[PDB]
Design an enzyme around this catalytic site. Structure first.
Site, PDB file in Angstrom:
ATOM      1  N   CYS A   1       4.013   0.640   9.877  1.00  0.00           N
ATOM      2  CA  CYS A   1       3.665  -0.042   8.816  1.00  0.00           C
ATOM      3  C   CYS A   1       5.114  -0.286   8.550  1.00  0.00           C
ATOM      4  O   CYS A   1       6.219   0.510   7.844  1.00  0.00           O
ATOM      5  CB  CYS A   1       3.006   0.609   7.326  1.00  0.00           C
ATOM      6  SG  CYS A   1       1.263   0.572   7.497  1.00  0.00           S
TER       7      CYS A   1
ATOM      8  N   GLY B   1       3.398   5.459  10.521  1.00  0.00           N
ATOM      9  CA  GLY B   1       3.579   5.364  10.230  1.00  0.00           C
ATOM     10  C   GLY B   1       5.014   4.329  10.795  1.00  0.00           C
ATOM     11  O   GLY B   1       6.351   3.715   9.778  1.00  0.00           O
TER      12      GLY B   1
ATOM     13  N   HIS C   1       0.605  -1.564   0.302  1.00  0.00           N
ATOM     14  CA  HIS C   1       0.143   0.080   0.321  1.00  0.00           C
ATOM     15  C   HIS C   1       0.872   1.414  -0.059  1.00  0.00           C
ATOM     16  O   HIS C   1       0.523   2.220   0.021  1.00  0.00           O
ATOM     17  CB  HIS C   1      -1.060   0.119   0.854  1.00  0.00           C
ATOM     18  CG  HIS C   1      -1.224   0.134   2.488  1.00  0.00           C
ATOM     19  ND1 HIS C   1      -0.561  -1.278   3.522  1.00  0.00           N
ATOM     20  CD2 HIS C   1       0.243   0.719   3.011  1.00  0.00           C
ATOM     21  CE1 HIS C   1      -0.007   0.247   4.444  1.00  0.00           C
ATOM     22  NE2 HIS C   1       0.173   0.777   4.138  1.00  0.00           N
TER      23      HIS C   1
END
EC number: 3.4.19.12
Lengths: 298, 298
Positions: free
Chosen positions: A142, A140, A41
């Site tokens: 991820c 942040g 993503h």
């Protein structure tokens, strides 16, 4: 003595964390050999997320659209399920001995929470029966990973992608397959019904006995079938003979038969703690596996 | 979102851990530059421990009586309070930027639990008001250290020496001074009365509000003096204006005044939770400092 939620030492994983930026989005990547793994993503804008065609969005991207910082030139990019694999011009000299594993529900791992490719903290999580984890993750985070260490090998099992509106977390294995029914699309999603991990609560009662809390022990025993009638009423997973076998080492260290501990758990479920605590808790804990207890107490 | 007890990444400390053996005793050492630091009780037999004259016992020891393994020839040995400093022929090439600090009661740190010079796990501890910690330590864990990481510097604050018969742990700073009244002699010892760290419980209530648990909030406020009358009844430390100032960042992130949160804590103390939970706990938590909440939530 003492019993604490304990993470694996994180050094081997710290040297693998990098920062990946695509457009306005910055998240973390895992750098192993000459590949950086991160959530796919990262290539999406907020509008793309409503209905992303990841194949088409990836085709539009070029190697120069990815900015990879470790403290790295991208020479190739590909997608494997929900992970992006950025081939880089430099092999990580800090690459540890590693494997990618898809862990089972009820199992635990350490999470190295990261922001901007920099590790911030480490803590343990169990993969819930509904394939969510209860962690601590902000925007942040991820690309932060979950792992176990077995002998001298890092087994990566989780990569962080999202938080559900119930405040629990979801992500994928390192091959990009989500745990649970979740998708990397900005669409309404909800975790399935969760249950308590019975074998883990029994492991934690053994940890409590090893560490001096014995008040909940009683003279009674139960059959596996009679215990499972109570487990059902309290939304606890059915206990199997395989779970009984997995608890064997704890039964040997304490001398307390598994079905005898099941009678203690039955009484705690039906009557509560009557204002008492077990290992500094007023609730039953299910995020320690039997192996977590054995390794910590040995 | 989510709020978890989080340890610092341990990599910088992992590379400092070594094994120290003297006679039949094996414990851990901390190798920084060309010095290995460890508990001085490593030189004692069980009979020596009943009444040790450490000065005389150290005089009898020679450099060859210490076997130091990292995965090191001892060229000098000295004692600083309750720590032994073994000068070795090789500077640790993995020595991080470090400082030795003596931490205050109520403050937290990460413990890297070790056995035979090998790190096993990492977890957070608070230094209790009675100068004990509630950790997880078995025989052989002596010499395991506690630390904080500030920017890029490891601040070592604790070295493990013992477990008291109440099941809590005691040790020294890296200069060898015990926290609390404890001594490295096999004589009956007991920790002083403990109290709950009020400023930390308030920090954890702010963490709960930040993370969606708000049921305990009320319209009421209190004076610092009226709150302290309740704190006394429940064995909570008196709250000072300095504690109120330390909570300032949390009061700004949430918009909830410190004395307003004190009224919530007053109601929880007097009435309990009525079967409800705060951040997955049925008891009030006091092992998170205000800075621990700020760093995790930011």
């Amino acid at each position: 003595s003492g019993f604490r939620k304990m993470a694996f030492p994180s050094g081997k994983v710290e040297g693998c964390m990098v920062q990946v930026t695509c457009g306005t989005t910055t998240l973390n990547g895992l750098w192993l050999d000459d590949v950086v793994y991160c959530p796919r993503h990262v290539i999406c804008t907020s509008e793309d997320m409503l209905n992303p065609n990841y194949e088409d969005l990836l085709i539009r991207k070029s190697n120069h659209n990815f900015l990879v910082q470790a403290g790295l030139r991208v020479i190739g990019h590909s997608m494997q399920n929900c992970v992006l694999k950025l081939k880089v011009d430099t092999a990580n000299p800090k690459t540890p001995k590693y494997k990618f594993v898809r862990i089972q529900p009820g199992q635990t791992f350490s999470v190295l929470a990261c922001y901007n490719g920099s590790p911030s903290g480490v803590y343990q999580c169990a993969m819930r029966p509904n394939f969510t984890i209860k962690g601590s993750f902000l925007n942040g985070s991820c690309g932060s990973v979950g792992f176990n260490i077995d002998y001298d090998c890092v087994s990566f099992c989780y990569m962080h992608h999202m938080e559900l509106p119930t405040g629990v977390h979801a992500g994928t294995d390192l091959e990009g397959n989500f745990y649970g029914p979740f998708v990397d699309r900005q669409t309404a999603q909800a975790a399935g019904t969760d249950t308590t991990i019975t074998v883990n609560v029994l492991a934690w009662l053994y940890a409590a006995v090893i560490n001096g809390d014995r008040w909940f022990l009683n003279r009674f025993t139960t059959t596996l079938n009679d215990f499972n009638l109570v487990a059902m009423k309290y939304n606890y997973e059915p206990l199997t003979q395989d779970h009984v076998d997995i608890l064997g080492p704890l039964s040997a260290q304490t001398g307390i038969a598994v079905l005898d501990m099941c009678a203690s758990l039955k009484e705690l479920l039906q009557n509560g703690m009557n204002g008492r605590t077990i290992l500094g808790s007023a609730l039953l804990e299910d995020e320690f596996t039997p192996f977590d207890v054995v390794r910590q107490c040995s």
